[PDB]
């Protein structure tokens, strides 16, 4: 599951808040489901343009295709910033 990670982010956002078991299972299904979706779109992106490697290009394009507006743009901001940090770290 994603349980302890929902716990880590949950305490980073709301340290005194808990979560029901069923809600944790829902979050687990959510991450796995959306994960399969996005990875699938990245795979067909690789198909369309004859690429055999899913890089930052494919993920960015996949987000821009799948996510609307502010979420997508700032997702690229946080992601891209993070990758820059990864080049640093």
């Amino acid at each position: 599951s994603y349980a302890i990670y929902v716990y880590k982010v949950l305490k980073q956002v709301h340290p005194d808040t808990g979560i029901s078991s069923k809600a944790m299972s829902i979050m687990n299904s959510f991450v796995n489901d959306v994960f399969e979706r996005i990875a699938g779109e990245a795979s067909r992106l690789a198909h369309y343009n004859k690429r055999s490697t899913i890089t930052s290009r494919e993920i960015q394009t996949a987000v821009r295709l799948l996510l609307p507006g502010e979420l997508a743009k700032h997702a690229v901001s946080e992601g891209t910033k993070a990758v820059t940090k990864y080049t640093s770290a």
């Binding site: 369309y48 394009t61 295709l65």
Partner: peptide
């Protein structure tokens, strides 16, 4: 969405197949 595919592919010309892929999306 087709233009997003074009920008990904580093191409300047949009093909018919690009439109097909866009529709399938």
């Amino acid at each position: 969405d087709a233009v997003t595919y074009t920008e990904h592919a580093k191409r300047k010309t949009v093909t018919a197949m690009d439109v097909v892929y866009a529709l399938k999306r």
